[PDB]
Amino acid sequence: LTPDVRNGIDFKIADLSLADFGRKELRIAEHEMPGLMSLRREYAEVQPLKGARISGSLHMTVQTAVLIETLTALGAEVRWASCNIFSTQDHAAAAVVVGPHGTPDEPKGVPVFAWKGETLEEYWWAAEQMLTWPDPDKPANMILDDGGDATMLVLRGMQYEKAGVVPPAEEDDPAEWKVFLNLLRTRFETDKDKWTKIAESVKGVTEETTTGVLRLYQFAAAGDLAFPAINVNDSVTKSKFDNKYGTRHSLIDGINRGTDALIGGKKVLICGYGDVGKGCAEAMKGQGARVSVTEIDPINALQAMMEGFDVVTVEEAIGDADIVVTATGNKDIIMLEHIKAMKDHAILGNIGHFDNEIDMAGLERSGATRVNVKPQVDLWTFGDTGRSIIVLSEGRLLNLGNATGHPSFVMSNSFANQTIAQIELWTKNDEYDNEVYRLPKHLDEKVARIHVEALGGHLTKLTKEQAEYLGVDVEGPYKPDHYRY
Amino acid sequence: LTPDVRNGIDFKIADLSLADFGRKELRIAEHEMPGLMSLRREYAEVQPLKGARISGSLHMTVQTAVLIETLTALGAEVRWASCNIFSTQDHAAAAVVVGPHGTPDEPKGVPVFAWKGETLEEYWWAAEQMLTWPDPDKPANMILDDGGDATMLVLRGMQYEKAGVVPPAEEDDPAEWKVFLNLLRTRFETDKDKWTKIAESVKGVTEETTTGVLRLYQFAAAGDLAFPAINVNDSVTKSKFDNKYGTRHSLIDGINRGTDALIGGKKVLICGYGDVGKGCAEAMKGQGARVSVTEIDPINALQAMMEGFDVVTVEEAIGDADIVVTATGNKDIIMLEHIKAMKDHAILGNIGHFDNEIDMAGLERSGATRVNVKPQVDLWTFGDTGRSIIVLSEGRLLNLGNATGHPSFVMSNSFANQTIAQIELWTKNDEYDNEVYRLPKHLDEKVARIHVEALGGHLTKLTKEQAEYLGVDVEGPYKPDHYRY
Amino acid sequence: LTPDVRNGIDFKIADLSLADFGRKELRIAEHEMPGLMSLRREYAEVQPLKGARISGSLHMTVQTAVLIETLTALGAEVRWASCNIFSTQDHAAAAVVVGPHGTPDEPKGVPVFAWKGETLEEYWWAAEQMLTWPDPDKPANMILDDGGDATMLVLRGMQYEKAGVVPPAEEDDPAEWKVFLNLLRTRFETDKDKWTKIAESVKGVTEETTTGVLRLYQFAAAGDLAFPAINVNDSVTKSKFDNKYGTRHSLIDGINRGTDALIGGKKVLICGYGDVGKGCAEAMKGQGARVSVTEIDPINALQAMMEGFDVVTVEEAIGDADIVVTATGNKDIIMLEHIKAMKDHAILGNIGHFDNEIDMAGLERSGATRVNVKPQVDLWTFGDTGRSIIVLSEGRLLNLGNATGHPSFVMSNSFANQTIAQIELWTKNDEYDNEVYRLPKHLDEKVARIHVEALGGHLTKLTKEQAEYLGVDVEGPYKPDHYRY
């Protein structure tokens, strides 16, 4: 379509009149997010992100809305879009455009391009607008990314400019791939150096998620990582708290809002048992489900068995499982042949990445019929067997599609890491090369201590003899770099 | 307020057009409810309930619609009303008026008087409409009650018609008591034998929850139970499953939809540790919460400590609690002095009974300012401390007000008990005196069997020598009458 | 054998020199057994049990030691025998014979006829020794019993006396039945009226375990209960604590002493999900095990599924099970054919009753080879499959045979029930008929309160208005009598 404009701010959301509801919820998230509020007070005078022009691509939720206003509290200008077609919280997007001090007729916030229920075409357009700053002599100079979509637009964009052509999409490529090229091919017809000029301008990217960090590795190994990158995902306080315990919280929320199906007493299959696999399984156990897991990695599999779970393959467990949940971050986990053998009215969901863990393209062209129950709940029925399957969020993240994603105090951790990673890549750009980096242990321990204190946990303080005995400083770090917690 | 009437059906709901949506979730729900679906098969030809005119007072949820259409499949005529002002699922209510083979233009289901977010005046108007059948010759001849507001309206209704006067409300009476008395008083100045006529027509009551069953004990003690009552609550497959595992599910959902407070790592105070208290503590402990309990009973209290919870008074733990849940079925549990001691932005909710476990009158009278966040969530702020708390559903059942109540498969237990109870009191009425009964053990066992079979469990069968050793029939019952499971 | 006699106390134990070790652990246990130490204090001056001559059949442990010495503190005379051939803890029996003030040279305690590792013959000789008081004018006038063996001697012995003959055993009879029949026959020669005299003298029996109480229920239905009986098993503070939270303690101890098998990660099969079964499953799940349950009762079977356990048959699960535990109180659970199907080096144990849950006579006669590894551990090998299984305590109670049984504090609940039952039946004998009984709610509540105050927990006291709301006294009882906790 065409961006909305109002009082200096271009944007495109569902409804600005939701801003008042949003503001109330933001204000409440603030009291649950000490990672960001503590970062606001510390960096208030310094203004470390001044000059920064951050293009962000992360689910547009209340929690992100508090992160965005942490970045502007520290000097930055931002533009934003979501990273899933279903995860935008519309009242959040609207509080963000309107700002703490504006009204919907006079918005005083930041540009936002997101709404719940985008098509694939609307998602890539919203993307483009987030990356395309209004003065051509001042492009995006930082990226905050989730799952690697922004970075993939710029780096593929550039790689097709440099080559003078965008390749025509093969028929058997995702329909999102067809859409992605169309955006660049149509852009290239008019502007030949657009993504090149943005790439050469961006001083670093901070990436939130495991799947995004796998893409960052494939760019650096091919030699195309065109700017420094921080792996925020693998901070101890991100991966072992947001990936695991945010999920222990929000799988349950996703499933309860989608279905009115009992968890306890049912057979649940969790695919993959990494940090997201771990949390899915612990929530289900705690609700008294009969859990089984799949894994490729014998270490991760031995962990499952020790925590009380059968390790099995999909084809062994599929036709008896009541609830099936993919959490591997890999493709082609649950296929049409598997869906076809699922019990009647079994629940299928993905909590990992994109929509390729579950074979959605195969299911659509199989001859099953779909009845939409409500947004992001669809019942599919096979005429030959008579059996039906409930599918959540069209195979895309069910905790963000069917619910609200992880609670506020969990994102306080993940986003404290994101704020810290932006400061260090902006103010210290000189010390980093075009490779993937992780934040030092002290910064990880900084963030955790904030939350330990907010919870009321009373840390023991080492004596001088005890620090000497351990080979550590009283103030930390307390552990070796390889330490696994 | 006047009832709507299409194709001979009087009703008052939120929106008929929601029926399609409702009907889709009712069909899904029938697949989750083997207990009720078994009973429709079994008694289809017998029509055991032909001639029944059942007035029901019970949360008008999707689970409850599956029940109502069970009673009608078994031959009954029913009229319905919710028993909480927040508990109606308007799409459920719509599906029920319209019936499996009707449409909103030509509905073919049953009279319903129910919408989400009724006022106290609308609530009681509804109950009267539900108890008042079209033909003054054919009143209600059966009651289905959840909490005892249908039984109270009839039994007190007749008490005041006999005294020849409905007393004034004292100025300190509970607002619902005054609203309730205003109903009986206004009916009496036009119709002086109304409640006596229905009370003498009513062949029996089947009662759903603990609180309702206590009322039934106090009417029977005072000589004032005018009809047989079955205590469905204390069916084994109801008390130990609905109250415990149902709540383990639906406590989480309520807090998740109301807030985005993380549960893991948080200090949670459960008040009361009977079966609702036992579900609440197990839901929270499985999400990582540090739980403590309050109890008056030394036995329940010793059970709590043996499952790893501190047993404390509200006085000593209120200031530290991140979430406070009241689950006692008794009043005066969390007083204004206690709300005022709560940490800034803590969560207060009740999952027990009515609205008086929490001092909601005192809170509302106190001078505290209320800001409404969204439906059933309010933030209250004290200008003396500067602290706020979040209160869910105005102090009323949080699981059915903020979310949707216990999930379907649980409610197949409760409502197969309720159907079985209505078949018994209707068809064997001669055999019952005017007092409180509980169902026979073999009936509990038959209910549970359905559910074990549906989930896929395999029950062992006793040989003739083991049945003999045990002193039991191979087909049960298997336990002494005092057995506690 | 011939009883030993020193300082006028007849006895027969393993080694009196253990008394010293015995006394320090007895004293240790007192600090852990509030219910018994409180009763000693309350009824100190009263001396309620003066005149009592208590013949007790109960596992001769440090816990029981504490009981025996409670009953003597309150006035009674006692004589004791274990109720399991392997349960005696010989240092505890030493200390009971020597008494708190005696020495091995000059004992000042009570007659004990117990050692660890008895033969069936020694077992029953010990039984008759404990029931046979020195003075023919002053027989036993009370029985404290666990499993019903002492009651069985008196009542069957009295049956053959009134009939004039003790019958022949058939070659089919179990080894212990033929030894039981042997003892009574050999006595009917020199003493025609021994047991009739004791039945008439016995004022009542108190019975500690589920299986004992079944035996009593069967004596009452056959019109043969010669004296009142108290079912201590089915006190709330016994069944719901000892049967379940004691087993959750002692099942684990028995397996760790018998073997060094990891529990975590292994498949476990628990036969029976009553109270002992519910505690077994709970132990294994908190240690990491993959637990499945077998059951005949569909209610108990559905409680299992809701706590995260498949309900399965022995036929379908026996070959996958690393540990098999029987928890039924029924005979014929694990037969020869099931043992032969067990995987190599799997552990078989029984925590229920006697030794016929496991087909131990089938095994012993099968052709299999036994290597004794150590006391109460044996490896049995099938020359035809070449597989070996480990059998704990020869199929008798694995928690008392291989370990020390339930811990001190759990037994303070069960044994304060027992002391209270003995005071009731002795000092208030007139109020009890010749049928089976359970203690009054208030007496259960008294027991729980003692142990709740000892653990640090704080009960809330009902206000006068809250007590009326509920229709209970501020001091209780607090629950209806069918109440299930």
Add this chain to the structure above:
Amino acid sequence: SLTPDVRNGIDFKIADLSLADFGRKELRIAEHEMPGLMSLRREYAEVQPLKGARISGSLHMTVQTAVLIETLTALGAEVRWASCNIFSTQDHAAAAVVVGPHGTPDEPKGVPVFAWKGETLEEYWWAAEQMLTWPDPDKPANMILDDGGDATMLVLRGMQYEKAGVVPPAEEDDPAEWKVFLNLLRTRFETDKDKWTKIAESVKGVTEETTTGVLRLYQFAAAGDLAFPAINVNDSVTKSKFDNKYGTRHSLIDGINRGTDALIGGKKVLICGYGDVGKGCAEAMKGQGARVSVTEIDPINALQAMMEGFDVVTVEEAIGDADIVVTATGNKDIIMLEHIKAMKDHAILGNIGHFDNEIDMAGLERSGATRVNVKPQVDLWTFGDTGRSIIVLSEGRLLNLGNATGHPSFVMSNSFANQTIAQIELWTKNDEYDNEVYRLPKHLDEKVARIHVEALGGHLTKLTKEQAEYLGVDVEGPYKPDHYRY
């Protein structure tokens, strides 16, 4: 002032050789639970990779270790063994080891062992020296397998005092073990002036089993006093995340249950430290229904603690009403006499970490409290001024091993599998290794894991050619980046 037994060419010193029939029974049973070790015997039998190895071992002398020992010898090694703790030796295990699968108490056919449960500190360091002192002066120890770094410390400190030419006088205020350690090296330096230096030349590598052992290994290295290559066995994922945590979940319960008859559920339990060993302690108690609080110095460990449902507190604020207190820090001075005086009457105190210094046993024994021994490794300590008593397990030394029998077999299958691979690699590939602390590669860590998964019956998924490609891993693994924390 004590000298070895010698029979059939074996020198040794144990409790009772007549316990060998019993021990062999338990050993064969343990083999069925240890496929990590049984797998390596099969893979490497034909090749015999440890030929020429003469391994001095200092690791608790348990059934579990017995299978380790008899695995190292199936692979060609010669071994001499002693326990690393004075209370952890299982006598019947020591016997079956000396006597071998095929010998007899009169004609033993196994390996020298210097170990009995309940050694004095003089007998511990004497057994250590023997274990390290091979019969042929030409051929001393050429490999170490150590647990907590006591063997490594004798060799390196021994050496250090030979080169300064004086074993230094023990202070007035030094741990009684330190006084006993020096006294050993000073009596020997009289009659042999280059004993330890010759051994340190001959030792080609050490493999260290435990977190405290590795702390000490890190300190020698920074001193530039690490004389030989060292493999950090503790820090494999399959040792650290399965022995330290899930082993302790099992055997903490066993220690407390054998020591006392105290119910765990319902009680207030306090765990100091929340690393791998602290996390297993907590999980065990939780699952027993305990009311658990933890202490921590590290805020990351502390936040994990709270997310699993535990108050995070200090000793001083929780000590007064804990029913059970367990230290798992591997750091010193956690429970001082002041804390002990504050504990509830008949409360339990134990140590599951290291040595004897987590708990102030030196201050406790000099305080005027009186001691009554209940049974081995159970002592009741009573304070005259309060009337109060505490139960102390294992004199403040490893309770899982002192009061019970250590981790179950299937748990050690993982640690000792990591130990057997460590020894193989450091012997057959010694030239690749500098004098530094080293960890094993991920594929060896996944190979150990795969052995046990498959024993337990877990069925892993196999990646398609396209799946492995997307992840950028080979089908056969490794599956995870090197920073990955599991």
